[PDB]
């Protein structure tokens, strides 16, 4: 899983907003710098900037 290093506020409807420390499952990472992520904390799914998150445990 991944963890957010920064908060992120969605800039389009299909982005995923998240908070620093939130645990994310990366569900698609082959389309570019923006990855499709599923929040394990909120259950929501949307695109995220890959440089705002890092591998977790």
């Amino acid at each position: 899983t991944f963890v957010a290093l920064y908060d992120y506020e969605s800039r389009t409807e299909t982005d995923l907003s998240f908070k620093k420390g939130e645990r994310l499952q990366i569900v698609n990472n082959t389309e570019g710098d923006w990855w499709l992520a599923h929040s394990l904390t909120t259950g929501e799914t949307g695109y995220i900037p890959s440089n705002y998150v890092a591998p977790s445990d």
Binding site: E31, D33, S50, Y52
Partner: peptide, 12 residues
């Protein structure tokens, strides 16, 4: 915070 990356290539 880091610069946001450009949006992905849209698929057709």
């Amino acid at each position: 915070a880091p610069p946001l990356p450009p949006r992905n290539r849209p698929r057709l």
